Amino acid sequence: EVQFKLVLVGDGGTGKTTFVKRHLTGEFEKKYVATLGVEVHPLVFHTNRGPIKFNVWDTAGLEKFGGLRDGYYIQAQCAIIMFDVTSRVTYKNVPNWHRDLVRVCENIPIVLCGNKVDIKDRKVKAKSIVFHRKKNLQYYDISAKSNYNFEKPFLWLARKLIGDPNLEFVAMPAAAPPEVVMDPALAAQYEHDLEVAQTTALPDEDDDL
Amino acid sequence: SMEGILDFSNDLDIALLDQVVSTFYQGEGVQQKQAQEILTKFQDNPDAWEKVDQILQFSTNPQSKFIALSILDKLITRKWKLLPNDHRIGIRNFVVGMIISMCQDDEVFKTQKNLINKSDLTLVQILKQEWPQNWPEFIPELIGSSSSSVNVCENNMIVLKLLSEEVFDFSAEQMTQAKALHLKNSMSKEFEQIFKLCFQVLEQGSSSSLIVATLESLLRYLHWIPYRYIYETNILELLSTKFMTSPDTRAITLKCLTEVSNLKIPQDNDLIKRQTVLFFQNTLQQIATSVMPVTADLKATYANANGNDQSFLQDLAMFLTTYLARNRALLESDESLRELLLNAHQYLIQLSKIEERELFKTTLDYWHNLVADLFYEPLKKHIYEEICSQLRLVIIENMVRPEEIQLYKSEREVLVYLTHLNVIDTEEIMISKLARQIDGSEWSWHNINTLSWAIGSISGTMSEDTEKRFVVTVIKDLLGLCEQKRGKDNKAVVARDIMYVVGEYPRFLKAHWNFLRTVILKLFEFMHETHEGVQDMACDTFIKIVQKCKYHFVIQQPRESEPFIQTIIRDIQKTTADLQPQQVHTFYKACGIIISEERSVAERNRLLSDLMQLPNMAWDTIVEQSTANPTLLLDSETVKIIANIIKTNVAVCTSMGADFYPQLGHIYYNMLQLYRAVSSMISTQVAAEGLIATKTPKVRGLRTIKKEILKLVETYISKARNLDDVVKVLVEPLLNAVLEDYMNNVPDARDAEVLNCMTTVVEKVGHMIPQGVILILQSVFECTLDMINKDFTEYPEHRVEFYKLLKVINEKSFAAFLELPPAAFKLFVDAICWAFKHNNRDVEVNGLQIALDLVKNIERMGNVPFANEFHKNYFFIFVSETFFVLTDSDHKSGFSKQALLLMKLISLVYDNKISVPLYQEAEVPQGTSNQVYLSQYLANMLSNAFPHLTSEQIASFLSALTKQCKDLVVFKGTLRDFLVQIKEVGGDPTDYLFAE
Amino acid sequence: DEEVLYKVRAKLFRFDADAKEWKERGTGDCKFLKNKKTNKVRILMRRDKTLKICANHIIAPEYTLKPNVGSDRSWVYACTADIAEGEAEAFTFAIRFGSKENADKFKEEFEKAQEINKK
Ligand SMILES: Nc1nc2c(ncn2[C@@H]2O[C@H](COP(=O)(O)OP(=O)(O)OP(=O)(O)O)[C@@H](O)[C@H]2O)c(=O)[nH]1
Ligand SMILES: [Cl-]
Ligand SMILES: [Cl-]
Ligand SMILES: [Cl-]
Ligand SMILES: [Cl-]
Ligand SMILES: [Cl-]
Ligand SMILES: [Cl-]
Ligand SMILES: [Cl-]
Ligand SMILES: [Cl-]
Ligand SMILES: [Cl-]
Ligand SMILES: [Cl-]
Ligand SMILES: [Cl-]
Ligand SMILES: [Cl-]
Ligand SMILES: [Mg+2]
């Protein structure tokens, strides 16, 4: 297992924390709770070349919650720059995030990600997105909500950091799960907990799943 | 213990800071997290800057010193001008001294690049503040200190690179226009001496790290310096030969030559043209001899991803496309330059084969430029024949599906141009690729799909005769392919592609009725195939063919007994029997397209009658049972049937618009009774089961009925031609059925689709129903506002539809707002300002537009009491609310419309277009002009909101603003200058005198 | 080492009692796998693209599939021991499918698997 420091940067509400949380737990957080300074989470993928661990430094996009700002970028080995394709200002700000990042990290693989491509009224058109070309950034359209291309930023960075272009995500063998006996002392405990959960609606009942 | 550094009453323990920082950067979990919070509180302490010089002197952690410089940078950029001159000179000296010291120690220079670069940026922040007016000798001393040491010279190149970026590349948003111009003129005035130094280092050579830093600074200079520094020195030769040969300098040099290719250059000068040719010749010669020949497999190289190969090949693509899009005409008329021209294009052909979507798009943009040129420019296509032949194959093998709209558009346009240039070569490549599908050598689902999309994309480029032969050959071959293939997966893939191709050649279908009939009847057969994707592609192909060939379905074709639309309708039950509801609706939508071609009213109404036969008979029986027994609606199966009848009506109304009226008229009464009956059931369910009821499948089903009814009425009214019938037949029953139901439901049961329907009604017939618009406001205004005025998040759909409704009422029926009681009108002004404060761009933009339109609505009323009372009550609320969202840095997307609103408000007073005093009496002399009072009010408001500004800054700003209130671009300039100045202390009040 | 008895596309949620909300855990192929040594049938579910495990538990005979108030194409059930995220934990799960038909078929197969597991 090798570990790499990954810095995630971009304007407030572009979907940085939502994207990371989806990768960590599988969940989709609908609410906007602005990151304060930085949130650090280990994230592990299983590849045909063994496990790879990203130490993910999810930084604050809002100026008032910026904390150490470029202080977070020190010794980063890779980066994602995030914008919102429903918000033109967030793409206008991509050169500013890139500037602040590369002044600290001169020679690292960087992915530019246009998030929220699931939303019908797209404001930053494909034709407009060219900033990555002269800066040698990889670019992906992503949706943390629909999971469109949600694995690509990490698959591309893993290939760059391992120096293997043929690297793939793989399924690890699944251990036989334990047989257990329901605890007769916690049986009344569980009918309660199940009552609450049966009578709370599942989210997004209109989706394909 | 870590929290010790936050205690400022005691001197700072550097060894503790160093541990906190180490904990943050190298620690984990709970410890990392806590160190993080402590460091942020330390940095944000407004006296923390005092500790910087101590930390820089006595810390052993380079991360501590980095964070110290961040703290210093906050002071320099925000509060520098508060410092006595002696203190500013002190800070300047301890920064310069730290930089020189670090550079003179070879070990530290090698290993502490982070801290040196951060120090260099800090120095540049001081230069932005101090230079040149309070530091005239900076550049001479930098040039002087550069000969003392290779490390200092190299670091000086990093400083000049960052200075150039800060002054020319990033100044627009970060400085006043006046300050940006001052620093640009200042660097321009001293550049001669900077360039001399850069050229000497490049000529004298030796240290690769120094040369690379120097070319990195040159890349920045090329954004702004005059061409003569490049064309009237040896630098073009050095860049295009020496620096292309060594791989350390090759990547930066290529980037420089790309920017050289974009210089502003004289057009009528043969020596400059020859120099432009020569640097290209030299660069391509160095690549062919030192990197790879023209024949090299760049697809393979890129895939292998060795070292910096990917970045180099991207940079080569950028250089070739940039240079050729500007200069290829220089290479086209001279026989001696033919080989250079075709080798450069041959490199682009090889780069275009790289498996990398974003690189492909870059090269495709160039190819589009070129083939568009060859289509129009005389005597040029013959040059590029072999390049274009290769490119035909690259585009055909790379064709994406039409769902990827921008990429498919680009690819189609290139392939269309190429097909015009050589139809025979395009045909030969497509037929031979089809042959390799049939012989199995290149067979795969992706490969037959790709080819089908390419064949589809050139429809309409060939002559009708050539198209005919081509289409027949392709369908014959794809049919052979289908038969040949085994198992349903393979057969489905080829069947879908046959359908796809046929659907893209309407000109062929329109000439061959017998073939078109066969296609349709075959599509009807496929609508019974349950194999995944077949029914969807059959329905998609049907509606696509109808959109294009609808006229051929509505006439009687020779040797047919009736128009084919009659034949479709007659067998509709059987045709659609195996389809999912959404597929059935597409089928009926397609029949609607055809029927709308019939312009004989009697015949059209009869076709519509016959098409709607099955949903109308299903409806009639349900309505009989629904009226007979109200309990029957509760049944899940009935709700799904009713929803699907309404959806069928929406589908046919979508394609028939105004023509759909007789069908709407047939169901209208009982549809609105159903709306009321379903509404009762929802209310009843929510009472019995609680708010959770709204999540249940039953209540979602019932709400679906209401939403589809609202959708059907908005669909019809948005396209209606006879507005008299809309107002006289549809509107009264609609308003009676929906408005009171919306008002008297609990928030969670209210449909945002009601607001959307009402928006279309006011849009189309608002002028004709003044009492209806009043009733709409009374029913939806205050109850919807109360749902959305507690936070920015709840009821997002209601939020959006609410401001769209207010916007159209304010445009079309402003009298409805005059009829409001004063309390209700005050809530309307509250609602508009509330919209201003939103970050969802939909609401904010409607908010600011309503404000504009309302001002215009009031101004129209002329000198009357309502207008006079409006200004007295609300002028200052709008001015201050607009200033609030302009300045709080939380509403930057709204900048343009905020400025437009502020300009209109200020211009009303500057023009004396407000009849009464805006001040209440004995607040100023009773003679006082509104202009004097507005000036006073704004000076006071800005002074309290921004107490760090001087009286001089505020007065200068407001003087400029009122003078520029007829010139939006200049006004916006002044506003942006103000937004820069409020982020710092001691902004120059003369900045507001700026003129371009 | 396992026979695939049933495969269906599904979205899996776990109930967060603290936040009193359903949190999605993964979307992908839900598989009923019969261990060829023990004849024990488990649910193994992998996320699309990452192929990371979001469900790994025995289909215990004592488990009961219940409706969710919001859905006609979902089941909720208490799981005493799931090993998807390492160490065995108890979860309240909800699994949602493309159709009521898919959910009913799942239920049918889940009961069959419960009977196989009774042996
Ligand atoms: N429709 C849609 N919404 C998304 C998507 N990704 C995130 N969101 C939502 O948009 C918001 C993003 O919030 P965050 O992920 O906290 O944003 P952030 O960039 O981390 O914000 P800061 O911490 O302020 O820098 C939340 O409301 C998300 O639920 C997406 O792909 N599609
Ligand atoms: Cl992980
Ligand atoms: Cl793009
Ligand atoms: Cl690229
Ligand atoms: Cl200049
Ligand atoms: Cl040209
Ligand atoms: Cl026609
Ligand atoms: Cl019949
Ligand atoms: Cl129907
Ligand atoms: Cl009222
Ligand atoms: Cl309010
Ligand atoms: Cl203000
Ligand atoms: Cl300030
Ligand atoms: Mg965040």
What residues of chain C, 21 to 60, have a C-beta less than 8 Å from chain A?
Answer: 21-27, 35, 38, 40, 42, 44, 46-54, 56-58, 60
| Whether the CB of A59 sits within 6 Å of ligand 1 | no
Say if residues A87 and A32 touch (Cβ distance below 8 Å): no
Tell me how many domains chain B contains.
Answer: 1
Say if residues B655 and B596 touch (Cβ distance below 8 Å): yes
Retrieve residue B349's tokens: 């052909």
Contact C71 B692 (CB under 8 A): no
**Which ranges in B837-888 belong to alpha helices (H)?**
841-860, 865-887
| Whether the CB of A14 sits within 6 Å of ligand 1 | yes
Q: Is B559 left (phi over 0), alpha (psi -120 to 50) or beta?
A: left
Say if residues B202 and B246 touch (Cβ distance below 8 Å): no
Retrieve residue A7's tokens: 């810095």
Q: What's the rounded Cα separation, in Å, for the pair B977 and B176?
A: 5
CA-nearest residue to C72 within chain B is B697
The percent helix, strand, coil of chain B (3-state, each to 5) is 80, 0, 20
Q: What's the rounded Cα separation, in Å, for the pair B101 and B155?
A: 12
Q: What's the rounded Cα separation, in Å, for the pair B152 and B165?
A: 20
User: What are the sequence ranges of the domains in chain C?
Assistant: 1-119
CB proximity list for A170: less than 8 A, separation 6 or greater: A46, A47, A48, C51
* DSSP 3-state of B794: coil
Q: What's the rounded Cα separation, in Å, for the pair B458 and B896?
A: 43
Atom of ligand 1 nearest to the CA of A21: 15
**DSSP H or E stretch at residue B616:** helix B613-628
Cβ-in-10-Å burial (0-12, 13-18, 19+) of A54 comes to: buried
Residues in chain A: 209
DSSP secondary-structure letter at A37? S
Atom of ligand 1 nearest to the CA of A35: 23
**Which ranges in B147-269 belong to alpha helices (H)?**
150-164, 171-174, 177-204, 208-221, 228-231, 235-240, 242-245, 247-261
Query: CB-CB: which of B32, B66, B67 is closest to A40?
Result: B32
Buried b or exposed e, range C68-104, using 16+ CB within 10 angstroms: bbbbbbbbbbbbbbbbbbeebebbbbbbbbeeeebbe
Q: What's the rounded Cα separation, in Å, for the pair C25 and C91?
A: 11
DSSP secondary-structure letter at A178? P
Output phi, psi for A55, to 5 deg: -85, 100
Compute, in angstroms, the gap from residue B832 CA to the centroid of ligand 11: 8
Output phi, psi for A4, to 5 deg: -130, 135
Instruction: Sort out which chain B residues have CB atoms less than 8 A from C70's CB and list them.
Output: 695-697
* DSSP 3-state of B444: coil
Q: Is B657 left (phi over 0), alpha (psi -120 to 50) or beta?
A: left
Retrieve residue B279's tokens: 């640097």
* DSSP 3-state of B745: coil
Retrieve residue B314's tokens: 């991207």
Single-letter code of the amino acid located at B941 = M
Please indicate the experimental technique that yielded this structure: X-ray
Output phi, psi for C15, to 5 deg: -85, 125
Domain that holds residue A59: 1-209
* DSSP 3-state of B223: coil
Which ligand gives the minimal distance to the CA of B407?
Answer: 3
Rounded to whole angstroms, what are the CA distances from B185 to B131, B189, B990? 12, 6, 17
Q: Is B695 on the interface with C (CB under 8 A)?
A: yes
Q: What's the rounded Cα separation, in Å, for the pair B366 and B346?
A: 13
Q: What's the rounded Cα separation, in Å, for the pair B645 and B666?
A: 13
Say if residues B568 and B575 touch (Cβ distance below 8 Å): yes
CB proximity list for A191: less than 8 A, separation 6 or greater: none
Say if residues B67 and A68 touch (Cβ distance below 8 Å): yes
Strand A50-59 with A38-47, pairing: antiparallel
Compute, in angstroms, the gap from residue A36 CA to the centroid of ligand 1: 14
- Select from A23, A25, A32 the residue to mutate for testing ligand 1; criterion: most ligand atoms less than 8 Å from CB: A32
Q: What's the rounded Cα separation, in Å, for the pair C90 and C81?
A: 5
Residue B835, Cβ neighbours under 10 Å: how many? 26
Query: CB-CB: which of C54, C78, C83 is closest to A178?
Result: C83
Rounded to whole angstroms, what are the CA distances from B794 to A120, B81, B789? 20, 45, 9
- To one decimal place, what's the resolution in Å? 2.1
Is A12 a known ligand-binding residue? Answer: yes
Q: How far is CA B938 from the centre of its chain?
A: 36
Buried b or exposed e, range C1-36, using 16+ CB within 10 angstroms: ebeeebebebbbbbbeeeeebbbbbbbbebbbbbee
* DSSP 3-state of B701: helix
Q: What's the rounded Cα separation, in Å, for the pair B851 and B817?
A: 13
Q: What's the rounded Cα separation, in Å, for the pair C71 and B703?
A: 15
* DSSP 3-state of B267: coil
Instruction: Sort out which chain B residues have CB atoms less than 8 A from C69's CB and list them.
Output: 692, 695-696
Retrieve residue B126's tokens: 């001081």
Could you give the angle at which helices B613-628 and B636-656 cross, rounded to 10 degrees? Answer: 140
E strands along B580-684, which residues? Answer: none
Instruction: Sort out which chain A residues have CB atoms less than 8 A from B255's CB and list them.
Output: 134
CB < 8 Å & 24+ apart, contacts of B747-750: B747/B783, B747/B787, B747/B795, B748/B686, B748/B691, B748/B694, B749/B682, B749/B683, B749/B686, B749/B694, B750/B783, B750/B784, B750/B787, B750/B798
Instruction: Sort out which chain A residues have CB atoms less than 8 A from B311's CB and list them.
Output: 136
Tell me how far apart the terminal alpha carbons of chain A are, to the nearest angstrom.
Answer: 34
Strand C2-16 with C89-96, pairing: antiparallel
* DSSP 3-state of A163: coil
Compute, in angstroms, the gap from residue B239 CA to the centroid of ligand 4: 23
* Cis upstream peptide for A203 (omega within 30°): no
Q: What's the rounded Cα separation, in Å, for the pair B189 and B191?
A: 6
Domain that holds residue B578: 1-996
Sheet with C2-16, side-by-side order of all strands: C53-58, C41-46, C21-35, C2-16, C89-96, C74-82
Contact A198 C78 (CB under 8 A): no
